[PDB]
Amino acid sequence: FTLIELMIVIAIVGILAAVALPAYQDYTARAQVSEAILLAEGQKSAVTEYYLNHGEWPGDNSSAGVATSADIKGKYVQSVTVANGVITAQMASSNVNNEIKSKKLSLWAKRQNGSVKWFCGQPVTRTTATATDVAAANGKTDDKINTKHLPSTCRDDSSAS
Amino acid sequence: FTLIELMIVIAIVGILAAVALPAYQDYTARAQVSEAILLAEGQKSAVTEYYLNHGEWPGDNSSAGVATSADIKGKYVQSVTVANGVITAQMASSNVNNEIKSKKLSLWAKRQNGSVKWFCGQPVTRTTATATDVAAANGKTDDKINTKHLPSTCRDDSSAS
Amino acid sequence: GEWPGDNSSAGVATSADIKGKYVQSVTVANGVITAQMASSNVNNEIKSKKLSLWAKRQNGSVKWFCGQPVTRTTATATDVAAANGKTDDKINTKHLPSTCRDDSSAS
Amino acid sequence: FTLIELMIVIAIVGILAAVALPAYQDYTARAQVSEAILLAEGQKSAVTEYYLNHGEWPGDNSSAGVATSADIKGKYVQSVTVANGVITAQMASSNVNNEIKSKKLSLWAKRQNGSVKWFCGQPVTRTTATATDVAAANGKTDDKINTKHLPSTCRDDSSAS
């Protein structure tokens, strides 16, 4: 009945190759998400510049005069969009974490002691291109990204100022 | 007693998920610190200009006529200050490396073959707005930042000339 | 262009700095870094043992080496010296895995 | 023999912390180099002015009447020199990329449809202060800087006209 001991070793192996893997489709997502974060970053400039020139954020890419929603893109990026200076990009719809598939988070800068502070966080939009305060246009959170599937920092709401 | 071998694999896992992570609260700090570095940089201009116009550094932001201590700020920046042309900003007091929480380092330019050379390094202050030589006003090193928690370069003392 | 003679040359966590389980020292030697086994709850054998970490400059930048406690001739240099500590801290290549079997000579 | 799998993970870590870092002593150099580029720029004016006034470049700083070789300097700059209007500065001899340690590249403007075009590139010198064409005085390329360790643009030879 070392066989048991064997079948034990079998048994413990039996229930050892199942459900012993947390959150990795969760984890890949973050980077897979974060890949999307990497792109619209540059848009912030003319967005600022537009705000810099004018004092008002650009209502969008085109207000800024820059690459629109369906513009600048690639892997994990099926849109890149500005909203009254609030910039946003979307996850791809495949080869992703099945979860984060096609998700976004906005990028909104509200004026500081310094110039302004952006925010890597939830899909939101600025009340006006003129304003700095932005609105949590949540898109029923689909594009919104799990703060879990987000890293610790990039967990911002429109409220972020 | 493959169970041992198992419990070994357990055991080696046992003492594998503890203390195997150096210095990352240390590392984040650097950037979290370095974020603070990013801001007072612009102040150097009028500071120079003040020194440029006058031949004397500005005793501070206000001597220069520029954004004071509690002026220009944001994340990881709970002050930004000039001291006889020596400029300094402080770490935030939260969401930081618990270590570097609320820390500074000065920025002091002393006149060159060229114009002058600044220094990213420890909270210090210039002897006079007129001078270039600066004093290692150390604030008991709290605001002073760990050269470890600093990157290799930004390791300057008032002595830096 | 020179390695740090140690943690402090680098300005970083010294020998008795960064540590925990199975780590009773962590030390740099002219850019050659080393840590020691604990002195208990270990393999009674490997109890209190080390192996250095030395990078010598490449076609690429440089290549480190997980292997025996050694030290770099100079902080300036890349070549490192097999400061062997009478092999106590040195670790059995058997009690080491196949890869982490490097001597100062490793370049 | 998950131990193997372990020692594998060890092994792959074994040969993972060695030689997996290209060209960064190469990269720092560029900026460390480029720092040196930043300085002699202003010399171009009186150099031009000398050429502007006269029609001839200044044989040097002193011909122009400006800050000589061992003049204007600082970090990564252990000389700044003009050569018949061709200006040049040298890398420091420490705290640098051990490679680029003490290296130069000239700065030579040759007359255009417009006025003239300078060139950020290899240590060279102008045939005459009167001329525009410059000579690839190469100093056995030590001061000359690796086009790799240079950025893409600043890759000019005396021939650059």
Residue numbers in the entry:
A (entry chain C), B (entry chain B), D (entry chain A): 1 to 161
C (entry chain E): 55 to 161
Passage from the reporting paper:
In the bloodstream an unusually tight interaction between the bacteria and the brain microvasculature endothelial cells is established, leading to cortical plaque formation that results in opening of the blood brain barrier and bacterial invasion of the brain. This interaction is mediated by Type IV pili (T4P), long thin polymers of pilin proteins that interact with two endothelial cell receptors, CD147 and the β2 adrenergic receptor (β2AR). The interaction with CD147 is responsible for bacterial adhesion and the interaction with the β2AR induces signalling in endothelial cells. N. meningitidis PilE (Nm PilE) is 78% identical to Ng PilE and 100% identical in α1. Here we report the 1.44 Å X-ray crystal structure of Nm PilE and a cryoEM reconstruction of the Nm pilus at higher resolution, ∼6 Å, than any T4P structure reported previously.
The Iterative Helical Real Space Reconstruction (IHRSR)41 approach was used to obtain the reconstruction, which after sorting converged to a rise of 10.3 Å and a rotation of 100.8° for the subset of segments used. The cryoEM map, with an estimated resolution of ∼6 Å, shows well-defined density for the PilE globular domain, with a central depression and a protruding ridge on one side. Rod-like density is present in the core of the filament consistent with the protruding N-terminal α-helical segments of PilE, α1N. This density shows that the α1N segments are staggered in a helical array in the filament core and partially tilted relative to the filament axis, with their N termini close to the centre of the filament and their C termini lying at a larger radius. Thus, we built a model for the Nm T4P by separately fitting the Nm ΔN-PilE structure (residues 29–161) and α1N from the full-length Ng PilE structure, separated into two segments, α1:1–14 and α1:24–28, into the cryoEM map. These α-helical segments were then joined by an extended non-helical segment, α1:15–23. The ridge of density located on one side of the globular domain is occupied by the hypervariable segment of the D-region, the β-hairpin loop, β6 and the loop following β6, with Lys140 prominently displayed at its most protruding point. In our Nm T4P model the α1 segment 24–53 is curved but runs roughly parallel to the filament axis while α1:1-14 is tilted with its N terminus oriented toward the centre of the filament. This orientation places the side chain of Glu5 in close proximity (<5 Å) to the N-terminal amine of Phe1 (Phe1:N) on the neighbouring α1 in the 1-start helix, consistent with a salt bridge, which matches perfectly the well-defined channel connecting the rod-like densities at their termini. The cryoEM map shows that α1 is non-helical between the helix-breaking residues Gly14 and Pro22. The new Nm T4P model with its non-helical α1 segment provides a molecular basis with which to understand the reversible force-dependent polymorphism observed for both Nm and Ng T4P2932.
